[PDB]
Design a protein around this ligand. Structure first.
Ligand code: JCM
Ligand code: JCM
Ligand code: UDP
Ligand code: UDP
Ligand code: NA
Ligand code: NA
Lengths: 230, 230
């Protein structure tokens, strides 16, 4: 049929990869596009570039933020378009779940890096110009967003559970800032973007503070109800 | 009709902008796309970004080369596509002359900046990946290339004639390196690219060592003969 495109949004270690890997197993009509940055954070040219860029980012964010953000967003568009053109062609009710979106790339991450002075004004204006044009040159437009809403403290604890060495230094204050941006964008809907259609996109907010790995049936029921409304 | 796409290639100050501004005046069926970098080197957001990036490049090329090259190539694709979709719709024999191409961006300039250590391997691999994908995601494929072939010494003298303050320090050695790349790509056809069709694209080589501003009729005759073969 026509593939429904749903973005899964949320803070670092809210449980997006966990949730998407749950969903993919529940229907042959359901496919997922993992976030390139998540895959880099685990042989391919993108993975080699991504692992180098991430390591350089941790060392010197004010040098590498523009390069990282442009490659993360390119990598995501390529991966989303490949799934959209590759998969679900025999499906009766096709749904593609994106682990985050080109909108979180710009309005959460790249925006935060500009706000932290890791990009200068020229880098940030080049990035927005690049993004505005790269997304118009639509096929990836979202039918819905699922917001996995967790407290900064939950996400800090989940960084600890996941155990990536590079992340154990990330402080609660950073997660608080990303949390505020997600709340402004997806709960209050106060954050202005350059994609008018986003103000009209339905949003499902799921509280994921309680562990769901062995107990996700209520969350998935909410997803199936939300999907039926689209 | 179908618009013929012709790239004008050549070293710094070979006379490309001069030649393109001559051609545009000779036919209502002929239009030109000036190089964004050339326009930055003279109020628009691109011009402000471009003027900042160029100035930063002269100060610290090993910091800004990746950012510059990505924005120069994006800016060119946008400008070429805008002309291709905007212009020549009532023309009987439409021709769009590009001041350089996405191929000179990568195989002349970005390649030289990698060779000079102004981009590291990751920057250069990200750039080529970005380029390979950004050009496939064809509408800008060239029908022909016109190579304005000038000696490094001619180009050094023409930098002097043009008088841009920032360029008066550019040394003959740099122009010699760019000259060699153009000769390898467009005369010897030894330079390998990732665009198979380029090996088959017709090339017209014009010697522009002699001043042509008041005496260009033989050059244009060669252009009209070349166009009739396409
Ligand atoms: C898991 C997070 C990875 N991540 C990013 N991830 C992204 C992204 N992810 C997915 C899609 C996308 N488009 N971007 C951007 S940055 C990331 C974050 C940092 C970083 C930035 C700031 C702080 C604050 C520390 N200071 C603040 C001053 N205080 C006085 C002391 C404490 C700490 C660490 C560094 C490197 C990377 C790589
Ligand atoms: C008119 C040229 C502008 N240009 C470029 N233009 C481009 C481009 N143009 C058009 C499309 C495109 N994609 N790229 C790339 S760099 C440019 C060139 C330089 C530059 C690089 C190297 C040297 C060598 C000097 N040293 C070498 C060591 N020796 C011991 C002493 C002498 C001197 C100057 C700096 C900034 C810019 C901006
Ligand atoms: O209900 C949950 C959700 C996540 N996690 C753990 O929290 C960490 C972060 O989850 P994930 O990678 O899914 O977070 P994302 O960054 O993808 O949002 C991982 O170690 C998960 O196994 C958990 O224990 N219970
Ligand atoms: O036959 C010519 C061609 C060019 N020029 C001058 O050479 C300089 C560089 O020309 P242009 O800007 O066209 O070079 P491009 O960088 O565009 O190849 C300018 O001052 C031109 O006016 C000239 O005097 N005679
Ligand atoms: Na599935
Ligand atoms: Na004309």
């Amino acid at each position: 049929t026509r593939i429904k495109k749903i973005s899964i949004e949320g803070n670092i270690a809210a449980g997006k990869s966990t949730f998407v890997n749950i969903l993919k197993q529940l229907s042959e009509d359901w496919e997922v596009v993992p976030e390139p940055v998540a895959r880099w954070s685990n042989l391919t040219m993108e993975q080699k570039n991504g692992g180098n860029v991430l390591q350089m980012m941790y060392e010197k964010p004010e040098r590498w933020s523009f390069t990282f953000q442009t490659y993360a967003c390119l990598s995501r568009i390529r991966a989303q378009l490949a799934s959209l053109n590759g998969k679900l062609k025999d499906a009766e009710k096709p749904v593609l779940f994106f682990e985050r979106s080109v909108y979180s790339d710009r309005y959460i991450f790249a925006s935060n890096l500009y706000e932290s002075e890791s990009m200068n004004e020229t880098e940030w204006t080049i990035y927005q110009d690049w993004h505005d044009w790269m997304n118009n040159q639509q096929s990836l437009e979202l039918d819905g967003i699922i917001y996995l809403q967790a407290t900064p403290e939950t996400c800090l604890h989940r960084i600890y559970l996941r155990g990536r060495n590079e992340e154990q230094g990330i402080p609660l204050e950073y997660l608080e800032k990303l949390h505020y941006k997600h709340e402004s964008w997806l709960l209050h809907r106060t954050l202005k973007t350059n994609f008018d259609y986003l103000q009209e996109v339905p949003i499902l907010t799921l509280d994921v503070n309680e562990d769901f790995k062995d107990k996700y049936e209520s969350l998935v029921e909410k997803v199936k109800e939300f999907l039926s409304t689209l």
